[PDB]
Amino acid sequence: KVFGRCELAAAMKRHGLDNYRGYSLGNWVCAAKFESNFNTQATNRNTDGSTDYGILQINSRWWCNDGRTPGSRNLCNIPCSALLSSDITASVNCAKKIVSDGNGMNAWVAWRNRCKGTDVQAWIRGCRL
């Protein structure tokens, strides 16, 4: 599923991401935009052989099991394919664990390079939330 901007904001808001660990909704929409272009089916392979999955590009090195990342962890206790669903619940619940682990949203390279310190509120402007 390829989300609309406001559609995804409302979905994320419903799942408790607005101001989660102090990160306003615009941060999450901005990260999703640049990680996946709002596409729940996005996958990308990393150089160490791990793979990033879904709308927030969550990494099989630590967070999910794809059966092909030897020596990795599965800290969200889910198959990585569950992160590709049109229902964002699994991605959001795993993202809550990631952002709580000490490093905040800096775990998302695109958020660090393209959203952090920008006016992220513009990503939810005009949306009915």
The region of 46-54, 59-67, 71-79, 103-111 touching Cl ion under the rule CB under 5 A is 103-111
Q: Is 119 a catalytic residue?
A: no
Binder of Cl ion out of 81, 104, 112, 127 (CB under 5 A): 104
Mark out the alpha helices in the chain (DSSP H runs).
5-14, 25-36, 89-99, 109-114
The region of 3-11, 24-32, 60-68, 82-90 touching Cl ion under the rule CB under 5 A is 24-32
How far apart, in whole angstroms, are the C-alpha atoms of residue 17 and residue 26?
10
Residue 59 interacts with Na ion (CB under 5 A)? no
Q: Residues 48, 54, 58, 61: is their CA dihedral positive or negative? A: negative
* First-to-final CA distance of the chain: 20
Residue 24 interacts with Cl ion (CB under 5 A)? yes
Minimum distance of Cl ion from residue 4's CB (angstroms):
17
Catalytically annotated residue among 7, 18, 48, 52:
52
Q: Is 7 a catalytic residue?
A: no
Closest CA to 124 of 2, 17, 1, 43: 17
Active site residues: 35, 52
Pick out the residues of the known binding site for substrate. 101
